[PDB]
Amino acid sequence: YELPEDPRWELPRDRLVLGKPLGEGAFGQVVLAEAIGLDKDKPNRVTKVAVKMLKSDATEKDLSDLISEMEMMKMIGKHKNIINLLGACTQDGPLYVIVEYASKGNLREYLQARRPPEQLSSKDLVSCAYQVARGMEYLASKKCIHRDLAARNVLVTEDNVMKIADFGLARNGRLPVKWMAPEALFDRIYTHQSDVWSFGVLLWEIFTLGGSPYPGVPVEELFKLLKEGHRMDKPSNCTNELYMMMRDCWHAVPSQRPTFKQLVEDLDRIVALTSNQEYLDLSMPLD
Numbered sequence: 001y002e003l004p005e006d007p008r009w010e011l012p013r014d015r016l017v018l019g020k021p022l023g024e025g026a027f028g029q030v031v032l033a034e035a036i037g038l039d040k041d042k043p044n045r046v047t048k049v050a051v052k053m054l055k056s057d058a059t060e061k062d063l064s065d066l067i068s069e070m071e072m073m074k075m076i077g078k079h080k081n082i083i084n085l086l087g088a089c090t091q092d093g094p095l096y097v098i099v100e101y102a103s104k105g106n107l108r109e110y111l112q113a114r115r116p117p118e119q120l121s122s123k124d125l126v127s128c129a130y131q132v133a134r135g136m137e138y139l140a141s142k143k144c145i146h147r148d149l150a151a152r153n154v155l156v157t158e159d160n161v162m163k164i165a166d167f168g169l170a171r172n173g174r175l176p177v178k179w180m181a182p183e184a185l186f187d188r189i190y191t192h193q194s195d196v197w198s199f200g201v202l203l204w205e206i207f208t209l210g211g212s213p214y215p216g217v218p219v220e221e222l223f224k225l226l227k228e229g230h231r232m233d234k235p236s237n238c239t240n241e242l243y244m245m246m247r248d249c250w251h252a253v254p255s256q257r258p259t260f261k262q263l264v265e266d267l268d269r270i271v272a273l274t275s276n277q278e279y280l281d282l283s284m285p286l287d
């Protein structure tokens, strides 16, 4: 109840028409809405957006977290492959943090909904991994460390653009552990390289059209598993190249893993060499 107005982002509270709830974050809830005259040069146009806000029983720390999240998004700056901040309503009423709307759910949902028997060419998947790596290297360049990268935290827009989400936060709602690198799992050491590992696992999710890592492997057992040096098996039909890529990401020594800069390169290359007519087969769709 002490928020300052930043005219660079402030949006008249009456220009926001709240609508269907898109769910609820952990530090609040998000609803779909239509923002009037958001272009500012086209004030008579509506723009579908996502508005994060606090619940009625929101603690003082929660608002603290929400404001903190908005300011980080301001710092980080825009980029095609991430969910971008569009405005905020901070005056005369509850705080509304307005960001981009992703009409096609998260990457996982998106993939599974596109399993055979629209579809996804073999290229669609690789270029898909390409965007996530861009968004990730951009954030990495902005000093930002995600700490929880996974298809579920990657949203898809009406134009099939991969946008990374919840990149401006800090602190087991969906069994995250399966995406954590060893040093991050055993010693809470998060870095850009540990985010690379999570990317490996996100590659796996992509070339299984939405599967869950370590299928059936008992969480408790997962621990010693990674220590012994075990890794998941190449996804069905996944190429040899892409499997090597994910193996590098899962390197035992975090310093020896690739970087998002490299990954973005390799993936840029690989996409240019992948057929747009090679539809994959999923006879045994795991998860």
Ligand SMILES: COc1cccc(/C(O)=C2\C=Nc3nccc(-c4cc(F)cc(F)c4)c32)c1
Binding pocket: 022, 023, 024, 025, 029, 030, 031, 050, 052, 083, 084, 099, 100, 101, 102, 103, 105, 155, 164, 165, 166, 167
């Ligand atoms: C950048 O980090 C943020 C900040 C604030 C909200 C979100 C967010 O998640 C969405 C942003 N656009 C969306 N379009 C459709 C569904 C969701 C969504 C909303 C939910 F509440 C849950 C969810 F899983 C997806 C979002 C992401």
